[PDB]
């Protein structure tokens, strides 16, 4: 029971570290998602003026 509760403690801390990881990966994705769209349109609006 000590082995199976050390594991329950480890899988509790791993699933909460993976929660804190998944949150900051979802925020760092949305920064990269929004910066991709902003950089994509500003290439297109530059080409739309340059012709």
């Amino acid at each position: 029971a000590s082995e199976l509760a050390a594991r329950m403690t480890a899988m509790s801390n791993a699933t909460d570290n993976a929660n804190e990881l998944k949150k900051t990966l979802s925020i760092n994705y949305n920064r990269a998602r929004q910066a991709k769209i902003t950089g994509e349109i500003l290439e297109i609006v530059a080409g739309a003026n340059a012709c």
């Binding site: 925020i27 920064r31 929004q34 902003t38 500003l42």
Partner: protein, 145 residues
């Protein structure tokens, strides 16, 4: 309100008046600074001045940069915040404490408008949203401020 001026633009107001109003409120605060008084200026959303000047210059068809803010975005807020100064005794020792307020999106300190003002400002007071939701008002994140 016996020692306070309130310079109020709203969201319904046009973008030029929101771009203008911190320079109005700073020049009200410079009238007393150079008359030997001490002054305290608060800008609520320097974040919203940056987006009103962005609105102006994209309508002016000016080439933008990061997050579509133009290049004059640093010089926007550094014309404003370099006017805050403890003056020397040769001028009468007026001061102007500036407390700008910048809103972040999910704590993105690496965002363009928080990172420009952090490079102008002398310090920063991080109010965090984990503390505000936990009832730790005022939600001042002490270790990062």
């Amino acid at each position: 309100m016996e020692y306070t001026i309130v310079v109020a633009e709203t969201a319904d107001s046009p973008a030029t008046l929101q771009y203008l109003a911190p320079y109005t409120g700073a020049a009200l605060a410079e009238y007393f600074m150079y008359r030997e008084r001490h002054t305290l200026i608060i800008y609520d959303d320097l974040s919203k001045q940056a987006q009103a000047y962005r609105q102006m210059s994209l309508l002016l068809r000016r080439p933008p940069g990061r997050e579509a803010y133009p290049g004059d975005v640093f010089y926007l807020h550094s014309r404003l915040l370099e006017r805050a100064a403890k003056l020397s005794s040769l001028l009468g020792e007026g001061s102007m404490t500036a407390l700008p307020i910048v809103e972040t999106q999910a704590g993105d300190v690496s965002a363009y408008i928080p990172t420009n003002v952090i490079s102008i400002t002398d310090g920063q007071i991080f109010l965090s949203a984990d503390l505000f939701n936990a009832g730790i008002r005022p939600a001042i994140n002490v270790g990062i401020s």
